[PDB]
């Protein structure tokens, strides 16, 4: 699209409509973009000394990108609630994007006095990496997505990436991608950039919780017909004499019943409690946390494989890195106290996946014989096994929406671990930069790189609309399901509202599983 | 009750705002809400036209009805006019019932 200077390049679309089966969440926000790295690509690396587990090598670019991989960039409390309360599941189908009403300003810091003014002509160029030839950054839970609250103006993030490294230094194989080596489209004012995408058949996120659970799944009333090993030894006057007898598992017997499927896999996490007291006093934050390691650098295992966060009656506990944790609007960056964060809870799964903090089961160790007692041992890490079945990490309104499946020789069940939809070809990276403006050059020629540009930034609005599909409920469940509600009682502030000084804020994390489906 | 026409779906609310103008941002990224905008306001004209219907009189009333008139006698200022310093002003409230219909 194209037009004039006194012509709005696009209108403001920010609705949300439900169609019974679909529902489209349109949404627009105003943004701003500075000139990063003063227009140059800069090489960047870990700090020489820095622990090995923390080295790196890569580049930062003068390019800034766009991102809305956060559910709340599309759903509004209320809306989300609608969804989350009457749908067995849902998934994204297609999207449409558009930047417009772009405007380029140029600040002038003459002595003690700045003065911003329109640089009409100068441009901002955009380009979408629709061929995925660029290090996909999104999906890395970074923060600089869209504001949950419309009215909020925002700054565009700067693109940076990482290649290979042998400590703080580069290794040859590492590649250096240059963003100008693409065909950016250049916008001036009166210019807009639209583009549209279509998702790929993915599974509806399961937005329901299970009423039955693996173990308790058969019918009480009837005993099976298969037998199991009831007792081993037997009374012989005073002493026992080994004599194995078997029984037919019934209701009273349950624990012993024969089955057909196994809980999901696991990778044991340390348990910490919301109650300061209980927790051993010391620094096992890193030392005790569950991790894995590549090329000799141990990394953390955050968002551990999807597994319930606490047994019955222990909402007080949680994994050291088995859950998602968001900050309460305002919460500072580092070492903030428990009271400043919102920890997610995944009890809803208990029913199928193991509890993060407790071992999977316990396999037998030795082979018993008359002169040898029967061994056994608990298992803290069980990789996928036939017959296992499980549930993936719920979603949360202010959580990630999707993530790119890495291009590898092999993947195994790609639901992104941080939760979300695992996409092979996700929404392409959208980039934006401000074509430089060489400030006054010298009369006599010089072949040096230009270094003195006009100080200036850009701004303008952006809009994103997405169509989601739904799987409606359908249970013959007689008694009421659970629903997500807002507290009745009076409060000094409404949830998901602007305070007295107009600061919007999300009180709690809102999950997705409320409706109840049987297993 | 304050008088007027009671409408089920009255003339829709019309709103207007000035899309903000982020004044000069810093070179290094920050995910905070933007708070420094360009100081500016808008202006321009607006127009409203409305079509009203009427029910004309029709009484066999012989003697004159009452009508609303403006005072004959001289005055320092005309009613519904700008004073000496150009300040328009409505002297009195003007009703609507003057014509006389039987009950």
């Amino acid at each position, epitope marked *: 699209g194209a037009d004039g200077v006194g012509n709005s390049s696009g209108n403001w679309h920010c609705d949300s409509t439900w169609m019974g089966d679909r529902v489209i969440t349109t949404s627009t926000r105003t943004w701003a973009l500075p000139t990063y790295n003063n227009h140059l690509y800069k090489q960047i690396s870990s700090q020489s000394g820095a622990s090995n587990d923390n080295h790196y090598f890569g580049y930062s670019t003068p390019w800034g990108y766009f991102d809305f991989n956060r559910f709340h960039c599309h759903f509004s409390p209320r809306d989300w609630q609608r969804l989350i309360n009457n749908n067995w599941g849902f998934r994204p189908k297609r999207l449409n994007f558009k930047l417009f009403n772009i405007q380029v300003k140029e600040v002038t810091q003459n002595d003690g006095t700045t003065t911003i003014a329109n640089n009409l002509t100068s441009t901002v160029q955009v380009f979408t990496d629709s061929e995925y030839q660029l290090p996909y950054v999104l999906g890395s839970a970074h923060q600089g997505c869209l504001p949950p609250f419309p009215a909020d103006v925002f700054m565009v993030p700067q693109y940076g990436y990482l290649t290979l490294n042998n400590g703080s230094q580069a290794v040859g194989r590492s590649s250096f991608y240059c963003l100008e080596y693409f065909p950016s489209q250049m916008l001036r004012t009166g210019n807009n950039f639209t583009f549209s995408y279509t998702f790929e058949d993915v599974p509806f996120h399961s937005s329901y919780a299970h009423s039955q659970s693996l173990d308790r799944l058969m019918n009480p009333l009837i005993d099976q017909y298969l037998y199991y090993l009831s007792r081993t030894n037997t009374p012989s006057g005073t002493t026992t004499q080994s004599r194995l007898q078997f029984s037919q598992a019934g209701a009273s017997d349950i624990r012993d019943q024969s089955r057909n499927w196994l809980p999901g896999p696991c990778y044991r996490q340390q348990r910490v409690s919301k109650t300061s007291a209980d927790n051993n006093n010391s620094e096992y934050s890193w030392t005790g946390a569950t991790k894995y390691h590549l090329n000799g650098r141990d990394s953390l295992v955050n968002p551990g494989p999807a597994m319930a966060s606490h047994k019955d009656d222990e909402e007080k506990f949680f994994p050291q890195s088995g859950v998602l944790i968001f900050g309460k609007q*305002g919460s*500072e960056k580092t070492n*903030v*106290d428990i009271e400043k964060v919102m920890i997610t809870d995944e009890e809803e799964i208990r029913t199928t996946n193991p509890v993060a903090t407790e071992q999977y089961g316990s396999v037998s160790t030795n082979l018993q014989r008359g002169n040898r007692q029967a061994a056994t041992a608990d298992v803290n890490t069980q990789g996928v096994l036939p017959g296992m079945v499980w549930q993936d990490r719920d979603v949360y309104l202010q959580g990630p929406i999707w993530a790119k499946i890495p291009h590898t020789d092999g993947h195994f069940h790609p639901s992104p671990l941080m939760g979300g939809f695992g996409l092979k070809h996700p929404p392409p990276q959208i980039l934006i930069k401000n074509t430089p403006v060489p400030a006054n050059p010298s009369t006599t020629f010089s072949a040096a790189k230009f270094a003195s540009f006009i100080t200036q930034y850009s701004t303008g609005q952006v809009s994103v609309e997405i169509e989601w599909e739904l799987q409606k409920e359908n249970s013959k469940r007689w008694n009421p399901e659970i629903q997500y509600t807002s507290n009745y009682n009076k*409060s*000094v*502030n409404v949830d998901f509202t602007v305070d007295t*000084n*107009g*600061v919007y804020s999300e009180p709690r994390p809102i999950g997705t599983r409320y409706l109840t489906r049987n297993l | 009750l304050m008088g007027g026409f009671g409408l089920k779906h009255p003339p829709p609310q019309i709103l207007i705002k000035n899309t903000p103008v982020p004044a000069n941002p810093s070179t290094t990224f920050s995910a905070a809400k933007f*708070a*420094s905008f360009i*100081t500016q306001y808008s202006t321009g004209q607006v127009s409203v036209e409305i079509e009203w219907e009427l029910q004309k009189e029709n009484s066999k009333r012989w003697n004159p009805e009452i009508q609303y008139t403006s005072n004959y006698n001289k005055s320092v200022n005309v009613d519904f006019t700008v004073d000496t310093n150009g300040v328009y002003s409505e002297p009195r409230p003007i009703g609507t019932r003057y014509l006389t219909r039987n009950l």
Partner: antibody
Amino acid sequence: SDVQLQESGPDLVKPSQSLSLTCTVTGYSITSGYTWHWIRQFPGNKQEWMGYIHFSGYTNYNPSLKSRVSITRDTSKNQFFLHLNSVTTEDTATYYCARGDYGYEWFTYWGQGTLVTVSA
Amino acid sequence: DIQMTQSSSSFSVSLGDRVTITCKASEDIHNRLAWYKQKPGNAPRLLISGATSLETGVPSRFSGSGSGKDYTLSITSLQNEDVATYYCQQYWIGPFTFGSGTNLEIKR
């Protein structure tokens, strides 16, 4: 110049220690209305707003102080308290408690103030 | 944080004179500004709130005006009680911030 409200607490505190002050209000009830704030003045002159506690019991703190400040209340006693941990020499100042006519405006009633010096 | 700057750091004046103090904000406060008076060895007292509304019991001699960034406090005829330092305070957004203060020495 003039007001009502009274603060109490130790005049001296050792550095890494915690400062605890109490504000006793008379002629008004801590519940039912108004937010009660804490403000301090360094000996030079400036006033700095520490944070407040609402009638409902909700609190807001200055971001600078947030990590080491806690404000609580005892309705029975009609007193509200200030706790500042990890005190430093910079913390030396006169501490005031004040009421905030709330909703639209601010601090209607102030205390006498108590001087707290942080020294070894 | 919004920064408030107060004009004259100090003024000397006698009973009966008119004094004017200024306060300007780093950003538009929208008249959420209050003025306080503080005597030596004393705590502050609320003179005006909402930029122009006098607190109950405050004498008519005090008045405030302003909008946007700049506000002013005026005392028509100074009284002996008037000696004190005056501070402006913004309550547009947290954290609330105060001006540096203006010391009015009334007393010859």
